[PDB]
Amino acid sequence: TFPWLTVLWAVPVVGAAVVILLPAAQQVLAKWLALAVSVLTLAVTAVVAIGFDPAAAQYQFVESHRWIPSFGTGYILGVDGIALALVVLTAVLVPLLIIAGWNDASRQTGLAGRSVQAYLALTLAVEGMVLMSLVALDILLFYVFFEAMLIPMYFLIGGFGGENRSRAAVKFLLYNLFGGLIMLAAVIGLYVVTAGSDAFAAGTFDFREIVAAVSSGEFAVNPAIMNFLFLGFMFAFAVKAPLWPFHRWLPDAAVEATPASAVLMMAVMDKVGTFGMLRYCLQLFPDASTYFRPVVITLAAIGIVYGAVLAIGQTDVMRLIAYTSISHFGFIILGIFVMTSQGQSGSTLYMINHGISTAALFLIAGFLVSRRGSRLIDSYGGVQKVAPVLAGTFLVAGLATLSLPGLAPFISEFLVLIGTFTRYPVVAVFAATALVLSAVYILWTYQRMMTGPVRDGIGDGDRPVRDLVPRELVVVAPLLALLLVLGIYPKPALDVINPAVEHTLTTIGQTDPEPTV
């Protein structure tokens, strides 16, 4: 059996090294090679998904090797439905981001002319680390790459991006790294607890073994210690996936970074936080997660509503999209921690759908912002007349983020809301208010920017808003097609997701409550 996951995560990294090592004069060849590497990673992901059997064992394509036995951590890769979903999302998105940021790094000077090569290599490295984290079945390996993938994105923000790129990058890296270090505390605590338990030959980081031990009850732990470890993991993932109120880093980073990098952050990278929640926080600390479920459920619902309200209140398009993404992550976490088959399956499908939808919306907004020179909502008007295709695609992406049933995200949001009510009715209604709030902050922005008289300098002047160029269409059309497909026919995704989620529930002793009737 070929080491499919090893190749999957290594190809982006090796390609990044090659691209950065390319001569400065090979900028165009560097772009094409980076795109080829991303497409090769996508092909690897495709073969993995096709070979994946959702009815088979929980983890497939499992590769195991001794990496650092001294730390009780091994190079253990393996993909389940949850991990496979995010792997597919990342693999499909990254090529689209590359062709979206095709010319983003052209304006940067210095750096020995490696600006384009540096940008592409950083993007590929982020892809590789994200994939490796998703496929990792070892707690310490997962944490290694979860914390590692910050620095390439830190460079990708601070390098390139807007005027405030420095401050935005610092806030990004410091929030996420404070969370990651708080994780490290809990990871070392977990190692200590496992070593102090007879259930394992020594301190262990093998995720599958620890999960089996905790589920079987052999690895009993003092509830306080498990609670603290769960709190550390949760804080780390909450800063990573912008769970309210730990979200405050995301808006600045998203606005300041280039649109492609911002999408890579929110659409792909931040999903790792929610995935880490769903997998580790639940399967390692089922008791602690159950105990804290009310608190984090309340936090996620507050995040949903609060992010929607702020998005309504934002005067900046990109910041508005960032807060929309925060609210959607609130949905994701709410669906994860309601511990219901509907809830968790919907949260995973929402990871996918929000990734694609935010990618589309943020990239279209970035194209529009690039046409002009300001991100202000009031800076635009009547853009439909000048750029019918740009405005139409923006409308479609907004409707996706608005959770129309004709588009994928609704199927997910609905699924989450359903799952929420079976356990927490009031929280479910409070979240459902975000259905109206999304209509508000999407359609009001569309009215402000796309409708009305063509504002000065939009259809004329030195910086007119020309319609989407063919490359931007290449970026957009696949995303809109994916949204439509996953809205109309989500089953292919759910068939993959539903088994894994069931296993997760089966592992944590949770089951969807039976109907009252």
Partner 1 sequence: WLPVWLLIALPAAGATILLLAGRRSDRWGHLLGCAMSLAAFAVGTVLFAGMLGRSGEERAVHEALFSWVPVGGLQVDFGLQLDQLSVCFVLLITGVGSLIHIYSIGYMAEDPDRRRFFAYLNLFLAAMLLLVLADNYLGLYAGWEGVGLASYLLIGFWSHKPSAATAAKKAFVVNRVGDMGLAIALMIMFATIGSISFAGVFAAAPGLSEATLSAIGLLLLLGACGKSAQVPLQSWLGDAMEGPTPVSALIHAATMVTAGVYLIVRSGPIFDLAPTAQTGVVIVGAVTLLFGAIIGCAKDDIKKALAASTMSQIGYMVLAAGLGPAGYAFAIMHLLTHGFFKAGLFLGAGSVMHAMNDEVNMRRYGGLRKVLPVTFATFGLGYLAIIGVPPLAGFFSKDGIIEAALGAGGARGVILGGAAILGAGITAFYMTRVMLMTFFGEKRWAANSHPHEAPAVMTWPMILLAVGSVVSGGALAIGGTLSHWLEPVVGTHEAHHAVPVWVVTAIVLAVVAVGIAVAYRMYARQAVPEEVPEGSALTVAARRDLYGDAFNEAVFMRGGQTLTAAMVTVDDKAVDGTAGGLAALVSRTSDALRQVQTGFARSYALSMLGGSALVVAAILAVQLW
Q: Are 340 and 324 in contact (CB under 8 A)?
A: no
Q: Are 316 and 237 in contact (CB under 8 A)?
A: no
Q: Determine if 312 is a binding residue for ligand XP2 (CB under 6 A).
A: yes
| C-alpha separations of 258 from 134, 181, 186, 387 in Å | 24, 27, 34, 22
Please state the closest distance from residue 406 (CB atom) to partner 1, in A. Answer: 6
State the Cα–Cα distance between residues 181 and 13, nearest whole angstrom.
24
Please state the closest distance from residue 257 (CB atom) to partner 1, in A. Answer: 18
Please state the closest distance from residue 30 (CB atom) to ligand XP2, in A. Answer: 45
Nearer to ligand XP2, 199 or 312 (CB): 312
Q: Of ligand XP2, partner 1, none, which one does residue 422 interact with (CB within 5 to 8 Å by kind)?
A: partner 1
Longest dimension (CA), the chain: 75
Please state the closest distance from residue 437 (CB atom) to ligand XP2, in A. Answer: 6
Please state the closest distance from residue 513 (CB atom) to ligand XP2, in A. Answer: 27
Q: Determine if 444 is a binding residue for ligand XP2 (CB under 6 A).
A: yes
Nearer to ligand XP2, 64 or 433 (CB): 433
For residue 87, give the nearest of 12, 183, 144, 176 by alpha carbon: 12
Q: Determine if 50 is a binding residue for ligand XP2 (CB under 6 A).
A: no
Q: Note if the bond before 12 is cis, omega within 30 degrees.
A: no
State the Cα–Cα distance between residues 481 and 415, nearest whole angstrom.
21
Task: Tell me the window of 40-48, 103-111, 218-226, 439-447 that interacts with ligand XP2 (CB under 6 A).
Answer: 439-447
Q: Which two tokens stand for residue 374?
A: 């300001």
Q: Residue with structure tokens 């262990």?
A: 204
The residues of the shown chain that bind partner 1, judged by CB under 8 A, are 171, 175, 245, 247-248, 306, 309-310, 312-313, 340-342, 345-346, 382, 384-385, 399, 404-406, 410-411, 414-415, 417-418, 421-422, 425, 428-429, 432-433, 435-436, 439-440, 443-444, 446-447, 450-454, 489-491, 494-495, 498, 502, 512, 514-517
Label each residue of 387-427 as H, E or C: CHHHHHHHHHHHHHHCCCCCCHHHHHHHHHHHHHHHHCHHH
Q: Determine if 440 is a binding residue for ligand XP2 (CB under 6 A).
A: yes
Please state the closest distance from residue 171 (CB atom) to partner 1, in A. Answer: 8
Label each residue of 95-164 as H, E or C: HHHHHHCCCHHHHCCCHHHCHHHHHHHHHHHHHHHHHHHHHECEHHHHHHHHHHCHHHHHHHHHCCCCCC
Q: Determine if 447 is a binding residue for ligand XP2 (CB under 6 A).
A: yes
Helix (H), strand (E) at residue 63:
strand 60-68
Please state the closest distance from residue 432 (CB atom) to partner 1, in A. Answer: 6
Nearer to partner 1, 121 or 231 (CB): 231
Q: Residue with structure tokens 């996706």?
A: 400
Q: Determine if 436 is a binding residue for ligand XP2 (CB under 6 A).
A: yes
Q: Of partner 1, ligand XP2, none, which one does residue 385 interact with (CB within 5 to 8 Å by kind)?
A: partner 1
Nearer to partner 1, 51 or 492 (CB): 492
State the Cα–Cα distance between residues 283 and 505, nearest whole angstrom.
9
Nearer to ligand XP2, 148 or 432 (CB): 432
Q: Determine if 178 is a binding residue for ligand XP2 (CB under 6 A).
A: no
Label each residue of 145-203 as H, E or C: HHHHCHHHHHHHHHCCCCCCHHHHHHHHHHHHHHHHHHHHHHHHHHHHHHHCCCCCCCC
Please state the closest distance from residue 179 (CB atom) to partner 1, in A. Answer: 12
Nearer to partner 1, 10 or 404 (CB): 404
Q: Determine if 453 is a binding residue for ligand XP2 (CB under 6 A).
A: no
- The residues of the shown chain that bind ligand XP2, judged by CB under 6 A, are 312, 433, 436, 440, 444, 447
